[PDB]
């Protein structure tokens, strides 16, 4: 059972990193959106 637990924990951490980058760049994309409209 350790296989699935490790896999899900690692995927959770990877998703956390992905959203962390998302939030880090968020001001930039909001600036781009503001320019667009």
């Amino acid at each position: 059972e350790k296989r699935a637990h490790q896999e899900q924990t690692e995927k959770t951490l990877k998703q956390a990193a992905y959203v962390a980058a998302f939030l880090w760049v968020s001001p930039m994309i909001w600036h781009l959106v503001k320019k667009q409209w």
Binding site: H5, T9, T12, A16, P27
Partner: protein
């Protein structure tokens, strides 16, 4: 990097202070007690802050019979020890390497067992705040991490909106894989800062969201709704009235219990607290008065206190 920094965003508050305006200001969760309790505080210096508190609580299950505490604080260092009846020692040390970077370590010990020992480093930047804490950290022969590790990141997307995540790693024994969960937090501040909204999609599908409003310099009110198989949540309405002589806090709960907390400053030093609550679902009441004596031990401190 260079072109995008024209925004000039403001640093949002730390993750822990996300609900400070409501949970710790316009609610009794932290100020409430039961039965009588006398709190004597002794001040020895001001420029380097030093203080020696005492407590005599009787009739409160949560509070101890006696508790000696000494709090030391300066410009960049802050320490606090707390001896408790039954020789239960609690301690907290805060050291600021830089003006905006601070490392905090808390340690609670009861009967020779360091049950609590958290070490966290807090980093604050122009636009984002990140802090990581490790509860009961240790190492094992197998080499894997042991104890609970918690990391939180908050970044201000806009001056009036900040978003962040809260990563949790917990491992109880180490033999089994350590469960890890992630939580999402959102903090919105009005352009005028009149009202502050905070949302928290905590782990295990738990949603803790609250609101704060400043009616006037004296009156500020806020709301907090909690949610946690079947859910178990309560909605709380609270308001606080502050005056030069007293501080009032009232709160109506969805569970039906009604509570208030009055602190009369009869004297600049002596403050008498009254704390009552009612439980309309079971028709029982828990009420506790108290004291707060702040007496200095230095002539200069007394001169400052009297003005």
């Amino acid at each position: 990097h260079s072109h995008r920094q024209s925004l000039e965003l403001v640093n949002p508050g730390t993750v822990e202070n996300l609900n400070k305006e409501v949970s710790r200001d316009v609610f009794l969760s932290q100020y409430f007690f039961t039965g009588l309790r006398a709190d004597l505080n002794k001040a020895f210096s001001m420029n380097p802050a030093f203080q020696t508190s005492h407590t005599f609580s009787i009739g409160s299950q949560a509070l101890p019979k006696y508790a000696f505490s000494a709090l030391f604080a300066n410009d960049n260092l802050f320490a606090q020890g707390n001896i408790d009846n039954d020789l239960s020692v609690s301690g907290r040390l805060n050291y600021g390497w830089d003006k905006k970077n601070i490392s905090k370590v808390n340690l609670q010990i009861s009967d020779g067992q360091p049950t609590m020992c958290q070490l966290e480093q807090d980093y604050q930047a122009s636009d984002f705040s990140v802090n990581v804490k490790t509860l009961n950290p240790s190492f094992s022969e197998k080499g894997e991490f042991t104890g609970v590790a918690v990391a939180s990141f908050l970044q201000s997307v806009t001056p009036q909106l900040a978003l962040g995540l809260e990563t949790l790693y917990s491992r109880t024994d180490g033999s089994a894989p350590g469960d890890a969960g992630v939580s999402y937090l959102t903090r919105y501040v009005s352009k005028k800062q009149d009202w502050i909204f905070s949302g928290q999609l905590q782990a295990n599908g738990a949603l803790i969201a609250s609101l704060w409003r400043k009616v006037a310099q004296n009156v500020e009110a806020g709301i907090e709704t909690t949610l946690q198989p079947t859910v178990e949540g309560s909605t709380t309405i609270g308001a606080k009235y502050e005056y030069r002589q007293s501080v009032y806090r009232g709160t109506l709960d969805s569970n039906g219990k009604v509570a208030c907390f009055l602190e009369r400053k009869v004297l600049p030093t002596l403050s008498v607290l009254f704390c009552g609550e009612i439980d309309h679902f079971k028709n029982d009441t828990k009420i506790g008065c108290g004291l707060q004596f702040e007496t200095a031990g230095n002539q200069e401190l007394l001169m400052l206190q009297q003005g």
